[PDB]
Amino acid sequence: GAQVSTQKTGIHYTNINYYKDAASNSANRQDFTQDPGKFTEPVKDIMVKSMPALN
């Protein structure tokens, strides 16, 4: 009961976990999430680029 994922390109690769503890698995590098809104624009008030930050 394996699984096929795509490779890192500019084709996939098959894979099976042989161990019972998920900690044994390899690093998940096919991951790609991202939220910069935490660090930039953490203002309660949404800002329009065209507008001024004071009006």
Partner: protein, 271 residues
């Protein structure tokens, strides 16, 4: 993947994409399309290699020790209290985040060297070692042969020199919902005593030792420990360590300049 560029022509408006109020604390979402004309560019660049997972997921030495094949009195084995602050490299990396959560991939590189003597007729057999982990509270070894090396419960690894380096996986053994990289607090409720990360620190010791003495000739083996975070989670970014490290049990430092100086505030010939 990165965002591609948008085609931009000339403008004439009361719109001020070029001016904001940094005092806001909000970072500008200003692209080059504003404040200048641009062609259209379908950008394929991927940020794949800057993912938190990839930034950390790489084996790094965190420490190492020594022990002799011989010595009367037992006393010829070593130990080390697990911790990741005795090495500059990795510490600084992990300390770019306040809290983190991850599994660990342990890899050991064991090597042996032979020292000068007078001993003759030496035809030394293979060397077999034993690394034994001892969770906090467990009975610790006293001599190269105290009963505790039976590891009836404590896990450990036996390895014969000449083979591929030993390796195991450790789950997220934290008590809280994550590992703490910093701790602006004390150990006791009366602020007396230990202050610093040193209080959250408590993950047991690691014991190494030769199983067989090999020969009567003096030998000294060295064990290198390598960590390698996997399945990573990181919270609250911090300013990388500016000052050099001075102690393993605290943040202590001696004041350092923000950067290096140049001749004028106009010198392009950077330092």
């Amino acid at each position: 993947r990165v965002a591609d560029t948008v085609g931009s022509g000339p403008v004439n408006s009361e719109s001020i994409p070029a001016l904001t109020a940094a005092e806001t604390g909000h970072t500008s979402q200003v692209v080059p399309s504003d404040t200048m004309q641009t062609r259209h560019v379908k950008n394929y660049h991927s940020r794949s290699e800057s993912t938190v997972e990839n930034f950390l997921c790489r084996s790094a030495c965190v420490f190492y020790t020594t022990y002799k094949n011989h010595d009367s009195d037992g006393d010829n084995f070593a130990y080390w209290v697990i911790n990741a602050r005795q090495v500059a490299q990795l510490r600084r990396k992990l300390e770019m985040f306040t809290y983190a959560r991850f599994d660990l991939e342990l890899t050991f590189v064991i090597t042996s060297t032979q020292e000068q003597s007078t001993t003759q007729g030496q035809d030394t057999p293979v060397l077999t070692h034993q690394i034994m982990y001892v969770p906090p509270g467990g009975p610790v070894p006293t001599k190269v042969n105290s009963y505790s090396w039976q590891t009836s419960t404590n896990p450990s690894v036996f390895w014969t020199e000449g083979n591929a380096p030993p390796r195991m996986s450790i789950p997220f053994i934290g008590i809280g919902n994550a590992y703490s990289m910093f701790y602006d607090g004390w150990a006791r409720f009366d602020k007396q005593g230990t202050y610093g990360i040193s209080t959250l620190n408590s993950m047991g010791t690691l014991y190494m030792r030769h199983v067989n003495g090999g020969g009567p000739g003096p030998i000294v083996s060295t064990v290198r420990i390598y960590f390698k975070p996997k399945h990573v989670k990181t919270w609250v970014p911090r300013p990388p360590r500016l000052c050099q490290y001075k102690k393993a049990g605290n943040v202590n430092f001696i004041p350092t300049s923000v950067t290096e100086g140049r001749t004028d505030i106009t010198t392009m010939k950077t330092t």
